[PDB]
Design a protein around this ligand. Structure first.
Ligand SMILES: OC[C@H]1O[C@@](CO)(O[C@H]2O[C@H](CO)[C@@H](O)[C@H](O)[C@H]2O)[C@@H](O)[C@@H]1O
Length: 628
């Protein structure tokens, strides 16, 4: 394999002797050159582990590097300063100061200009991280909420122009807020130019997707493929009008990109560099699990998928160090953590914690949550979880059957209960969610609905408000970067129009994708309304998290509370958090608290609590005790 020094000499071959000498002494080249030596080895090794001796590897690689240099050379000076800061501070993602928020630009603020006018609110809330849902061109009507990309560079006209996007990003950086967007690298819409030209037989896009002449191979692949949207189609393939079949893990209008073609990696790396130079701080790598296929396997979490992501990572370390990756893997817990690494995805969603927060609200027993916090929370250095309560997606019950089995819980039976409970098909349930993708051949099913709808705020359950604070308190204090689903901080309910909208009716996820609720937001400072109670109480926790060093980092050690209804953990051996998941008062005995200081200040209620006597928590009460 070629080395960094050799490849760099060829990068400079585009310049004449005179120009070359100039580049050689330029600061930008010195930076690029240095990073090349440090990170190229990783890029080469990863690409080689996937493509091996492919004739196109070297040519593609040199093309990619020439492009990377030009990209970095063009990269704005201010962004280069962030590159340097990020290089020296890899743990910025682990700081307790970070608090994130996510929203659809159209649903939350109409368009990009309106979104820009919302930044003051974001500052008011304390956000330092803002993730914006799919903003680029996509099919009219059905685009899976923008996840069917027809272009990675042209902004959705209803949202604005690429120029408005740069302004938003600039304004966000000005307000001390990092910009986060998706990089839907596993698939494009069937309307993307690459898809059209590939299907048309254009030789320049040959093998950019997986297209078959008939069902022979698809049938074989389907023997082991998991169905993501069984409502849409069986297996992982959709048929074209001409009779051929294309790989479509998701909607039929979302075509899976063929990373087995090195030219596909190169093309996507080019798109990534474009996003990077827009000033994006973090890219949410959509469906990282599916970027590699292999007959006879589930075609999820394969070795090459990880390798390819680690390759993309090295490209950033070389051409835009400030850009981090956020893994979005909604799979088995054993697989989820594999995407998280300083050299792969520095951060990643923590679906296990999210899914278990809801499990605990339903069962009132913290067993599974405690187990997860005890054995699957701590991560390798310079990485962090993105902890959340809800998102634009349905809730999948991705806890491990193996973990459950150890607690004497049947995974399959338990999900049946959870699914019944959260869609209000279980006696006494307080949840008002809606089913999503119930698969009759597997029994699998997911849940849609906003945080407030699932906790019972729609029917004014007196415990609804406190339930929301409890869930969010855990995502805000366990360690990691918390991501608030904007709208939750004021108890926004489900959208009551989606079910009859012909473009949304077959996707219950729109139930939990409501528009900015003027009314609720106008009540955020009124302590007598649910909106104000949720907001002020959530804002208080944010204020505490960001100013109190005891919440720094992402490591935690659980504490055995000896009360099956109360979760307990300790941060930096100085902050003891208790969360009561029962709708009834629950107690932590003095006996259990004997080793703790006799007194401790509770950051939540602001009162000093005695630990040398039975500690009783009110229904869904949360305590953040400073024991050091
Ligand atoms: O139920 C959705 C299903 O898709 C996943 C795959 O990671 O979610 C991401 O990708 C989908 C297809 O591109 C998007 O529709 C979805 O919005 C996005 O978060 C998982 O959440 C799940 O397996």
């Amino acid at each position: 394999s070629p080395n960094s020094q050799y490849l760099k000499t060829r990068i400079l071959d585009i310049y004449t002797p005179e120009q070359r000498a100039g580049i050689e002494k330029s600061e930008d080249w010195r930076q690029f050159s240095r990073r090349m030596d440090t990170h190229f080895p990783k890029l080469m090794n990863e690409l080689d582990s996937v493509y091996g001796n492919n004739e196109a590897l070297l040519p593609m690689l040199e093309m990619l590097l020439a492009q990377a240099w030009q990209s970095y050379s063009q990269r704005n000076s201010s962004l280069k300063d962030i590159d340097i800061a990020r290089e020296n501070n890899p743990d910025w993602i682990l700081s307790n100061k970070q608090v994130g928020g996510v929203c659809y630009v159209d649903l939350f603020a109409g368009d990009l200009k309106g979104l820009k006018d919302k930044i003051p609110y974001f500052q008011e809330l304390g956000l330092t991280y803002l993730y914006l849902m799919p903003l680029f061109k996509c099919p009219e009507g059905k685009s899976d909420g923008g996840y069917a990309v027809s272009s990675y560079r042209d902004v959705n006209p209803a949202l604005g122009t690429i120029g408005d996007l740069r302004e938003v990003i600039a304004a966000l950086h000005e307000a001390g807020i990092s910009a986060v967007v998706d990089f839907i690298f596993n698939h494009t819409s069937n309307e993307h130019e690459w898809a059209q030209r590939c299907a048309a037989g254009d030789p320049l896009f040959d093998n950019f997707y997986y297209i078959f002449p008939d069902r022979r191979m698809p049938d074989q692949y389907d023997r082991t493929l998991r169905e993501i949207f069984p409502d849409q189609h069986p297996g992982g393939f959709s048929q074209l009008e001409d009779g051929r079949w294309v790989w479509t893990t998701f909607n039929s209008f979302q075509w899976d990109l063929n990373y087995s073609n090195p030219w596909v990696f190169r093309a996507m790396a080019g798109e990534m560099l474009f996003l990077a130079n827009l000033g994006v701080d973090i890219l949410r790598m959509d469906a990282v699990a599916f970027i590699w296929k292999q007959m006879g396997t589930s075609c999820e979490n394969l070795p090459q998928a990880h390798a390819l992501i680690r390759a993309f990572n090295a490209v950033m370390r070389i051409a835009a160090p400030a850009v981090f990756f956020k893994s979005q893997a909604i799979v088995h817990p054993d697989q989820v953590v594999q995407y998280i690494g300083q050299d792969e995805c520095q951060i990643g969603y923590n679906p296990l914690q999210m899914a278990l927060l809801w499990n605990t609200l339903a069962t009132r027993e913290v067993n599974l949550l405690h187990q997860a916090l005890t054995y699957r929370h701590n991560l390798p250095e310079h990485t962090a979880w993105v902890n959340y309560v809800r998102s634009h997606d349905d809730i999948g019950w991705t806890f491990a059957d193996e973990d459950a089995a150890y607690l004497g819980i049947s995974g399959y039976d338990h999900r049946q209960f959870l699914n019944r409970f959260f869609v209000n098909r279980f006696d006494g349930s307080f949840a008002r969610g809606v089913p999503f993708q119930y698969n009759p051949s597997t029994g699998d099913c997911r849940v849609s609905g906003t945080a407030a709808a699932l906790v019972g705020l729609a029917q004014d359950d007196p415990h609804a408000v406190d339930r929301i604070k409890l869930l969010y308190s855990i995502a805000l204090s366990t360690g990691g970067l918390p991501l608030i689903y904007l709208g939750d901080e004021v108890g926004t309910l489900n959208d009551d129009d989606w079910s009859q909208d012909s473009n949304k009716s077959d996707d219950s996820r729109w139930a939990h994708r409501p528009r900015y609720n003027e009314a609720l937001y106008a009540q955020r400072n009124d302590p007598s309304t649910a909106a104000g109670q949720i907001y002020q109480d959530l804002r208080h926790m944010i204020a505490v998290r960001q100013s109190n060093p005891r919440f720094d980092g992402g490591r935690l050690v659980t504490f055995n509370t000896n009360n099956k209804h109360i979760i307990g953990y300790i941060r930096n051996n100085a902050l003891l958090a208790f969360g009561n998941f029962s709708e009834y008062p629950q107690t932590v005995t003095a006996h259990t608290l004997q080793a703790m200081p006799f007194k401790a200040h509770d950051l939540i209620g602001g009162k000093t609590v005695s630990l040398n006597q039975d500690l009783t928590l009110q229904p869904y009460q949360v305590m953040w005790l400073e024991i050091a």
